[PDB]
Each structure stands twice: as C-alpha cells, then as structure tokens.
Design a protein around this ligand. Structure first.
Ligand SMILES: Cc1cc2nc3c(=O)[nH]c(=O)nc-3n(C[C@H](O)[C@H](O)[C@H](O)COP(=O)(O)O)c2cc1C
Ligand SMILES: Cc1cc2nc3c(=O)[nH]c(=O)nc-3n(C[C@H](O)[C@H](O)[C@H](O)COP(=O)(O)O)c2cc1C
Ligand SMILES: N[C@@H](Cc1ccc(O)c(I)c1)C(=O)O
Ligand SMILES: N[C@@H](Cc1ccc(O)c(I)c1)C(=O)O
Lengths: 219, 220
C-alpha cells in the first residue's frame, strides 16, 4: 500500500548492552502488583506518557486495536467499584469454583476493592475485537496485541515510579463498557488502578522462578 | 499462604517522573519490527537479561506460565525454518484467505523467512496451558499472562539495542513443539528472531495513532 524506508537503529557497545539490560531487569524486578493505593494526585502528563508508550507496541497487521479509558472522576470511579464488587462477590461465592478460590487464598483477595475509590486514576484497557471509509477491518490476534501493549504499560508505570495491580474483573466487562460509553466492538481486557502505593501497602511474599526454570536452550 | 510483607517503592519527583516517562516513550517509539537480521553474534548475557526481564511480569494467580526457548544451533534453526516456510506458503496461498493476504500487502511479507537462518538467536515463547509436586494446576489467563511477558521482553530488547519481529507462524505450533521436545502442555505463542538489524534493513513506513486516537478520558 505505501513506501518502505531504511531502518535507523541505535547500537550500543556490548558492555553498555550488558549494563543496560541488567539494570532494566533490576528495575522490572522491583515491580509488584500493589493492591493498596494512595489517593495522592499523580501528574496527568505521566499517565499520558505511559499510555503513549503502551501505544508503541507491535500489533497484528498494524491494527493497533487498543483503547485506554482513563477515569479520574470520583462519582464514576465509585460506580465502577459498585459493579466490580457486586460481580466479584458472585465470582467468589459461585462462579470461580472451589479450586480457583483456593488458588487465591495466598493473595488474601476478596470482592472488596477499596483501590477502585482511592486510586487517583483507573486505566481500563479495552481490546477492539474488530475495527472500522467506515468499513469493517479484521483485528488479527487482537487479544495478544493488546496484552503486549499492557506489558509495555506495566513497564512504563514501573519506570515512572507509579504502582498498579493488573486486574481482570470477570463478568464485569459488558457492564463497565456500557457505563463508560464504549462501543460494542470494545471488550474489557484488564483494569489497572494507578498511583503511589499507600504508606502501609503490603504485598504477598511471593518468589519468582530462577532463570533456568523459565529458559531452555536447544540443541 | 504465604505471609504478607510491607511494600516499598522508589519515588521520583514529579518533574523526574515526566522526564523518565517521556524518555521511555521515545525509547520505545523507536522500536520497529525488523525482518532483516544480521548474522553477527550477540552477547548471551544480554539474551539472559531480557528473558529475566520478561520473567518479572505479573501472571494470573502467580502461575508464571511461560517457557522461553532459546535456539542458537544452525541445524535446529534450519529445521525451524523448513517447517515455518512450508506452512507459511500454504498460509499465503490458501489458509489466511484473500482479505488477510490483502491486509499484509503493505508489509511486503511473504513465506520466505531468511531470518530463521541468519539471526544468531531465536526465542520461541511457549505458554503453559496448565502446570504441575506432580499434581495438575490450573493456569488462569495464561495467554494474556504470557503475552504481557512478551511485552516486557520486547521492551527489554529495545532497551538493550537489539531488534526482532514478533511472529505468529500460523499452523506451525504442533510441529515446532515436537521438534523442540516441549511437553504437551506447552503451546507456541510467538517466535522472535533476535540480533542487530542488517546494514540495509528496511521497515514499512507506518504511522502510529496520535494520543487522542487511543486514549479516552471519561466522567459522569
Ligand atoms: C500478535 C502479532 C502477530 C504478528 N505476526 C507477524 C507475523 O506473523 N509476521 C511478521 O512478519 N510480523 C508479524 N507481526 C508484527 C506486526 O506486523 C507489526 O508489529 C506491525 O506491522 C507494526 O509494526 P511495528 O512493530 O514496527 O510497530 C505480528 C505482530 C503481532 C503483535
Ligand atoms: C492476566 C492476569 C490476570 C490477573 N488478574 C488479577 C485479578 O483479577 N485480581 C488481582 O488482584 N490480581 C490479578 N493479577 C495479579 C496476580 O494475582 C499475581 O500474583 C501477580 O501478578 C503476581 O505477583 P506480582 O505481580 O507482584 O509479581 C493478574 C495478573 C495477570 C497478568
Ligand atoms: N505469519 C505470516 C503472515 C503475517 C505477517 C505479518 C503480520 O502482522 C501478521 I497478523 C501475519 C508471516 O510471517 O509472513
Ligand atoms: N478477579 C478477582 C480474583 C483474582 C485475583 C487475583 C488473581 O491473580 C486472579 I487470576 C483472580 C479479584 O480481583 O479478586
């Protein structure tokens, strides 16, 4: 359809590549899902920059099938909280099933989500399951694409000194999509409450796998 | 459970938060999918650090359901290449369909994947659709979790001065999984050829949406 151009690349010496990759790992490794979020204001320009970063993600056939919905208004944050707490309660009681509920004991999560009120910003990431002269276009691998962008967003948040927890509000998508005025070709993928951690924020003492438990070399 | 411990955090002043996030956006915005990789060797230590970076991703219920399989052997890379080209060729002539094939024209991709040979490293990312001491265990949102890890990997590669292209070799999963001796609960998500760009690498002249085409602020 259009032209191709030389690729321009920044090369670092090997030593600098080691040190950069090291320190980026160290930076990302300090990231934890934080479920206790201060209501201190965050600068909107930072939120913008992290969403711009997420928007640099690759996507199947260059479709960029993502919408980041940002909610700061307290009335609206609280309506989102009412929906999530209602749905999550049924999820814990009924829909998740015993094994799932057991697998979550160690996180001490339940259906009470105070962070939906207290966090200064909520970011709801919607995938566009298809797109749109005004003709209908395929979104190839939209879920994976949008999840890659989420990864970039998480990295950008960590790099900027903000915290969050990646949530899936199971069975809340349609209610939240309707509430937020999103079109029917958007689904909710993930909800991220963003801000500074609370002073007494806590995290579960989880450990990550060692390198040789995640990387395999062949042949 | 699993005890719960205090969390702490490095905080930057607002002005540094702006700067850091501005800079990080510019760094990431320079990432392009590059389909012409140099055969020059890359430091294994960097490969490790990017994979470790990927391993810091959140995952549903702390399942860490990812395996990064790292191929450097010329014979194995070539076998990978044989499977993917044979399978992509059918994908282009018949399995994707006219519309998909049309949507790829602007990228000028075809079934020939010389990077599978020339790249010094391939990373194949497998999701673990469930896991196991010995008892079976349930990997919630494994696909999204591994794709988030992919996002971190891609960031880590850009940050490290390496390039790649995120690929999905349609209908190659089962043959790759078997070729690489991966167990039957692993399933290929994406393949990343890694290295420096060829001296004459080109990319399509694509534009990304402006901020107001991807970000919506909603109130009452
Ligand atoms: C999930 C998904 C699948 C992709 N599959 C292929 C592919 O199979 N072959 C390929 O050459 N590029 C593939 N790509 C890369 C996209 O075509 C590329 O990201 C897009 O054209 C935008 O280019 P950019 O990454 O430089 O921003 C894929 C990307 C995504 C995220
Ligand atoms: C796709 C996926 C879904 C997740 N869903 C939820 C969720 O609904 N609620 C929640 O509190 N955390 C969720 N998380 C956080 C995890 O429970 C998990 O323990 C955390 O990601 C692992 O700890 P860490 O992020 O601090 O490394 C999710 C993570 C992934 C990526
Ligand atoms: N997997 C094929 C086709 C392809 C290419 C680019 C792209 O964004 C997508 I979605 C598919 C290939 O590698 O050519
Ligand atoms: N969505 C529910 C339950 C939950 C919690 C953590 C987690 O990793 C997963 I997968 C699910 C909630 O937010 O509590």
């Amino acid at each position: 359809s259009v032209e191709h151009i030389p690729f321009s690349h920044t090369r670092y010496p090997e030593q600098e590549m080691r040190m950069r990759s090291q320190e980026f790992y160290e930076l990302l490794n300090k990231r934890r899902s934080v479920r206790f979020i201060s209501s201190e204001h965050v600068p909107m320009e930072v939120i913008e920059n992290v969403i711009k970063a997420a928007g640099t993600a690759p996507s199947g056939a260059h479709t960029e099938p993502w919408t980041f919905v940002v909610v700061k208004d307290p009335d609206m944050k609280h309506k989102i909280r009412e929906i999530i707490e209602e749905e999550e309660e049924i999820n814990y009681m009924k829909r998740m099933g015993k094994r799932w509920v057991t697998d979550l004991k160690k996180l001490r999560t339940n259906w009470i989500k105070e962070y939906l009120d207290t966090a200064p910003v909520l970011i709801l990431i919607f995938k566009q399951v298809h797109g749109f002269n005004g003709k209908k276009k395929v979104h190839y691998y939209n879920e994976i694409s949008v999840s890659i962008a989420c990864g970039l967003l998480l990295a950008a948040l960590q790099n900027a000194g903000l915290v969050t927890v990646t949530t899936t509000p199971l069975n809340c998508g349609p209610r939240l999509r309707v509430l937020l005025g999103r079109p029917s070709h958007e689904k909710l993928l993930v909800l991220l409450p963003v801000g500074y951690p609370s002073r007494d924020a806590t995290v579960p003492d989880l450990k990550r796998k060692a390198l040789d438990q995640i990387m395999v070399t062949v042949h």
